[PDB]
Amino acid sequence: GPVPSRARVYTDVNTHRPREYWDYESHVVEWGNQDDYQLVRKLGRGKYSEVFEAINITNNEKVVVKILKPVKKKKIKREIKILENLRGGPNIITLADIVKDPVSRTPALVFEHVNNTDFKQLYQTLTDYDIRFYMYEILKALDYCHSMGIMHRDVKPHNVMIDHEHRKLRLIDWGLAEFYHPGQEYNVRVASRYFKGPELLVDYQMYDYSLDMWSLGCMLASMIFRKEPFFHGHDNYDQLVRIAKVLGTEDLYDYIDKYNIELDPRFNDILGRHSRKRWERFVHSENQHLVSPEALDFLDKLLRYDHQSRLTAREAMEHPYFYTVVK
Numbered sequence: 652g653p654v655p656s657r658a659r660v661y662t663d664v665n666t667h668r669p670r671e672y673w674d675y676e677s678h679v680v681e682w683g684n685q686d687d688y689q690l691v692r693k694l695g696r697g698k699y700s701e702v703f704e705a706i707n708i709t710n711n712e713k714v715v716v717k718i719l720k721p722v723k724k725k726k727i728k729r730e731i732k733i734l735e736n737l738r739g740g741p742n743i744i745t746l747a748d749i750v751k752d753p754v755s756r757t758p759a760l761v762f763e764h765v766n767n768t769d770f771k772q773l774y775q776t777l778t779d780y781d782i783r784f785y786m787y788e789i790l791k792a793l794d795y796c797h798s799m800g801i802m803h804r805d806v807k808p809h810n811v812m813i814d815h816e817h818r819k820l821r822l823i824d825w826g827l828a829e830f831y832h833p834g835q836e837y838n839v840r841v842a843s844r845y846f847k848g849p850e851l852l853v854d855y856q857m858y859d860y861s862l863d864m865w866s867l868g869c870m871l872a873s874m875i876f877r878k879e880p881f882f883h884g885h886d887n888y889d890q891l892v893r894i895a896k897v898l899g900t901e902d903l904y905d906y907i908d909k910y911n912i913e914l915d916p917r918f919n920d921i922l923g924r925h926s927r928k929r930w931e932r933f934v935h936s937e938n939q940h941l942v943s944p945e946a947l948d949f950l951d952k953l954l955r956y957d958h959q960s961r962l963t964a965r966e967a968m969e970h971p972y973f974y975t976v977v978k
């Protein structure tokens with residue numbers, strides 16, 4: 652079968668935590684008072700919930716309320732336990748309360764409110780400095796959650812809320828996050844298409860924190876090159892082909908061969924042969940001010956087929972790309 656894999660860092664975090672920490676199915680939710688919060692306006696809904704701006708009438712503060720759809724009850728305590736485990740961590744959104752909504756008959760998560768500028772608008776204006784600065788803030792959040800034995804699995808621009816005024820960043824929507832246990836096989840149906848790691852795309856289930864680092868690399872490439880999303884596939888198969896047109900097919904084969912993985916035969920007549928490209932090819936007069944040798948080398952070290960070969964969050968923070976960011 653497949654060759655097994657282990658995270659190269661934080662491998663045994665959960666192994667030596669108490670069972671209460673990671674056994675989320677045993678978690679007992681501490682309920683707050685649903686009457687404390689008044690819905691103000693609907694912000695949107697995903698496949699799993701509806702999110703509302705609201706006011707906390709005990710202090711008149713703005714908050715956000717995420718009313719979970721009655722689907723996949725297991726996921727509910729997973730997301731709750733992960734938020735409580737990570738609460739107070741750098742740049743991790745704060746879960747302020749949990750209440751039972753009387754209409755949906757489901758849990759409603761109450762989060763801190765972030766006065767953000769949507770990425771579709773924000774990304775048009777980021778400077779070279781802004782991108783390094785915010786990348787560094789994202790890494791703080793990822794090193795934190797990885798060091799706490801959790802992978803996010805849904806890193807994408809929408810989940811990185813940024814108040815550009817106060818230069819405040821929060822990593823949100825831990826609804827796809829999971830505990831990392833060495834040797835555990837996970838569902839590959841996670842992340843948004845454009846940010847799915849090659850591991851998910853070739854059906855390799857024994858992945859780990861390094862998945863987030865691929866997603867981060869996709870974000871970075873979209874920011875420095877001003878092309879969002881960068882790998883813009885039409886479906887999960889074309890997504891891998893798009894990647895292979897940049898990283899090349901030989902290193903893809905090396906990857907699947909290392910883990911003795913077999914490509915879906917559907918790729919037989921769509922994958923072709925492709926050389927690995929140099930990142931400079933994506934540079935032009937409209938994004939060159941965002942690009943530097945340090946940026947390209949950092950990106951290159953994030954976007955690797957082999958999950959074991961990508962920079963960890965901690966290593967990424969040590970990269971020359973961030974020397975110019977004020978600490």
Ligand SMILES: C#Cc1cccc(Nc2nc3cc(C(=O)O)ccc3c3cncnc23)c1
Nearest residue numbers: 694695696697702715762764765823824825
């Ligand atoms: C569905 C939807 C939808 C569509 C557009 C905008 C938003 N806005 C916000 N979503 C959040 C989600 C979470 C979470 O899921 O952990 C935490 C905090 C926020 C948040 C905080 N502050 C301001 N806005 C949001 C949501």
